[PDB]
Design a protein around this nucleic acid. Structure first.
Lengths: 50, 36, 121, 176, 38, 204
RNA sequence: GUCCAAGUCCGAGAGGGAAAGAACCCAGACCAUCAGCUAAGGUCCCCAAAUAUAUGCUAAGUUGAAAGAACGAGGUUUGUCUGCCCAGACAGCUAGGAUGUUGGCUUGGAAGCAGCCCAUUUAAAGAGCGUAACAGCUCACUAGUCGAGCGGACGAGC
RNA sequence: CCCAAGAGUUCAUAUCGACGGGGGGGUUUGGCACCUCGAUGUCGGCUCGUCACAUCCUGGGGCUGGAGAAGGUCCCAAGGGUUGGGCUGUUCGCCCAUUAAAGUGGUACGCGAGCUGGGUUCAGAACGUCGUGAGACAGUUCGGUCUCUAUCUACUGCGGGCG
């Protein structure tokens, strides 16, 4: 129940890799709340920005 | 009159191959679209 | 501004006096038809001698409207009655006479046959 | 395997060097580079030995693939490949202004193409016969791509036969 | 090109190939024998 | 490539080849460059323009100090433009001359507020039925706002009654007619959002 | 779903597991304890415990919960049988591919190809496209080239 | 979707395809009777929309028994659009005139604390038929009260407090 632990600083996140064709076949769902507002991203598009 | 389609190739920096970029222009304006 | 279920006066010697509008050609859900617009009409008077019968379905063009219509130069034309001239199966007028004046907007739409035998334009 | 276990003996006059993944070939017509990943290629001085490590349904094909690619690059930069297109039809015209082709087909316009400086371009439209365009280059892949994007301007119809086709290369025809 | 659940060579010159994990039957001389979906 | 003006009125002129053309007068007074934001301290290239000068009584000490680093003094309307045509420094003035005769502009203005408006006047709904065939009290009602137990909630974005009001609207390529520079005129063709004597942003 | 028979459970039953489920798997709650060993099920994190060891398969994110067809396929691993093979195996390239004879019957026309019924020279020659019938192309087969594997049948796993 | 006897001048698969077989969906009529009879208001129409693609138009292609233009069939694709009237309470349907087109369906056969009550199941009356009779009809016709001041959440707008 206490906030123990350390603070982690990942310093090479731009150089991470996925094993299979997950960089091209991984989808992230970002539904907004409006009718018909289910947006789908990709692991390749998401790493192009931040 | 009549337009002229100018298709010029270029070494794209996204890959390194030879792509194709065409555009409808004047028959006397194809010289300025092939030198670039 | 002539729409469906609108009674017009036929202005030519084709043999009809009053007509009723059925459709305003020129697109989906077209509301009105000013001068120069094509409409589908049904004859309802059919003068005794005549050349057309009562109950037939034909096509016509609006020649005179009671609604003030605007030109490009900024002027307006407003007649006193809604009139129309019947047309052939193709783009041609049936008849050889036109009663009363016509609108100049009927000239930009290649209705030379209708505009070249009217009293005033 | 069978096509990869063959020598790639060089027509002396062209050199081949290997780098950290990149193989370069320098002849009399410019350098050509290629990237190999899962094959071991060694240049002895006369022959080029390309071999594989495992037989896992992928290296067994990459062996022959890279062997054929190196052989093509050699039989290219050494000698070079060439192809011929032929415009068939009435009113079709072809002209050359250097590295710039001008085609006049049955379209409502003309097509000018600024072919890359790595491909030659000659034309023969002497009197009445079909105009023959001829391309020549050391890169067979780029040569074929240019020929394909020239042929795609007008596909050969099956009824008459008019279209940008190669010399020879009989077409499928119908009655109509 | 027809889409069938069971492709088979409709002639002797047809070729069964696999594009992007999908079976195709190609016949360049007779193009009416093209099928897919395996 | 950008200016501030004030909507004067609206009239109609005649083209050199016949037809009449409605037009709107925009007293696009000489704007002054207040602050040039570069790509090294802020993160993007732009510059602020001030339009109408204020007094030394209504103005703030902060505004006085901000405009003291410039020429003319605290302005009524300050708006930041981007992607100009000529590289200019602080204190410069742009009167009207950035526009030509025959070009297109993208005037932007704040519309006039209508207040709390119903659905019929705000979104364009039409009635619930006729006026006399049994109609009781729903002549201007919205009707239904959803379906039954599925989804058992009103979807977000349902068009209902609210304050119509006036927001910022662009007019999308009005054609310029007169660009008189002695008296800042900028006579363009078309309408402009907002009442008279209202500030407008003319983007070239 | 409904009506019987042989058992168990819920009914009248707490606790643990499958994410949440009256019946499914384990297991029958006298209390209290900041004690230990186990059942089903699990040991990367949410969330207790193996980023444990040994062997092989899968490239589909199949799968990591349950549950799928007739019918296709040159995906891959593996067992047996099985023919062709340095007197030259399959594919590719080049050339030949005849004679009696245009076999007989029928047909205006049937000549290897609308329909029915051996011999000679050889390194070898058989009484699909198309032509009104011929013609011609191709195939069955053989000769030279490089020189090492080329294939089928029955299963089993994913 | 699988097999293909045929039909297609000859040619099973341009197009259609019998005799048979294997599945997907839960929009029709059903089977069961599992929550509601100390009340889950039922057909049609209006307003408001939203979703799926099993696509009507617009968009991109393959084949053709595709000379061109018009076609037939199949594949990918849901951004927008998808008319007005006569008859009937009608859904549906037929017809008239247009349009690029006049899509198929789900949401308690969407939506009655949003509207109408034209139909259906209230009390009156009459016809045909059954019953001796009181009375009844998936037979027809005329008339016939649709209650409630929005607490919580869900939406459309506008403010105060604090950070």
């Amino acid at each position: 129940h206490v906030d123990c632990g350390d603070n982690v600083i990942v310093i090479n996140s731009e150089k991470i890799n996925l094993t299979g064709t997950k960089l091209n076949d991984k989808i992230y769902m970002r539904h907004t709340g409006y009718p018909g507002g289910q947006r789908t991203l990709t692991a390749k598009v998401l790493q192009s920005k931040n | 009159k009549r337009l002229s389609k100018a298709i010029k190739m270029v070494k794209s920096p996204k890959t390194g191959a030879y792509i194709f970029v065409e555009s409808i222009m004047a028959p006397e304006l194809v010289d300025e679209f092939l030198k670039k | 501004m002539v729409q469906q279920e609108s009674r017009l006066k036929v202005a030519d010697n084709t043999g009809a006096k009053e007509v009723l509008t059925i459709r305003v050609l020129g697109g989906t859900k077209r509301r009105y038809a000013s001068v120069g617009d094509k409409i589908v009409v049904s004859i309802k008077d059919a003068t005794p001698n005549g050349n057309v019968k009562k109950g037939a379905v034909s096509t016509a063009v609006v020649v005179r409207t009671k609604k003030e219509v605007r030109r490009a130069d900024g002027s307006y034309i407003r007649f006193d009655d809604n009139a129309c001239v019947l047309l052939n199966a193709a783009g041609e007028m049936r008849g050889t006479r036109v009663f009363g004046p016509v609108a100049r907007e009927l000239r930009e739409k290649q209705f030379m046959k209708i505009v070249s035998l009217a009293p005033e334009v | 395997s069978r096509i990869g276990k063959s020598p790639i003996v060089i027509p002396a006059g062209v050199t081949v060097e290997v780098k950290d993944g990149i193989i370069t070939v320098k002849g009399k017509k410019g350098q050509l580079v290629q990237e190999f990943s899962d094959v071991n290629v060694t240049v002895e001085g006369d022959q080029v030995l390309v071999e594989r490590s495992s037989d896992h349904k992928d290296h067994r094909a990459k062996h022959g693939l890279f062997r054929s690619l190196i052989s093509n690059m050699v039989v290219g930069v050494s000698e070079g490949f060439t192809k011929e297109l032929e415009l068939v039809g009435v009113g079709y015209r072809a002209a050359n202004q250097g590295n710039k082709l001008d085609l006049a087909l049955g379209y409502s316009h003309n097509i000018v193409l600024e072919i890359a400086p790595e491909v030659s371009l000659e034309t023969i439209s002497e009197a009445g016969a079909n105009p023959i365009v001829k391309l020549t280059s050391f890169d067979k892949q780029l040569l074929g791509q240019v020929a394909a994007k020239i042929r795609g301007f007008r596909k050969p119809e099956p009824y008459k036969g008019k279209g940008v086709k190669f010399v020879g290369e009989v077409l499928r025809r119908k009655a109509g | 090109m027809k889409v069938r659940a069971s492709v088979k060579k409709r002639s002797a010159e047809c070729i069964i190939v696999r594009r992007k994990g999908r079976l195709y039957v190609i016949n360049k001389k007779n193009p009416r024998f093209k099928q897919r979906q395996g | 490539s950008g200016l501030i003006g004030k909507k004067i009125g609206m009239t109609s002129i005649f083209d050199e080849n016949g037809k009449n053309i409605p037009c709107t007068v925009i007293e696009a007074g000489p704007c002054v460059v207040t602050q040039v934001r570069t790509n090294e301290v802020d993160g993007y290239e732009a510059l602020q323009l001030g339009f109408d000068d204020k007094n030394e009584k209504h103005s703030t000490k902060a505004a006085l100090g901000h405009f003291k680093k410039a020429g003319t003094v605290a302005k009524k309307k300050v708006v930041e433009f981007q992607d100009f045509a000529a590289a200019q420094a602080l204190g410069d003035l742009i009167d009207v001359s950035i526009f030509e005769e025959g070009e297109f502009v993208d005037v932007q203005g704040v519309s006039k507020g209508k207040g709390f408006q119903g659905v019929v006047k705000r979104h364009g709904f039409g009635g619930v039925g006729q006026a006399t065939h049994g109609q009781h009290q729903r002549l201007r009602a919205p009707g239904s706002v959803g379906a039954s137990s599925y989804p058992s909630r009103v979807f977000k974005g349902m068009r209902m009654a609210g304050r119509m009001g006036g927001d910022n609207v662009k007019v999308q390529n009005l054609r310029v007619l007169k660009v008189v520079a002695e008296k800042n005129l900028l006579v363009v063709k078309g309408c402009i959002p907002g009442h008279k004597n209202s500030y407008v942003i003319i983007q070239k």
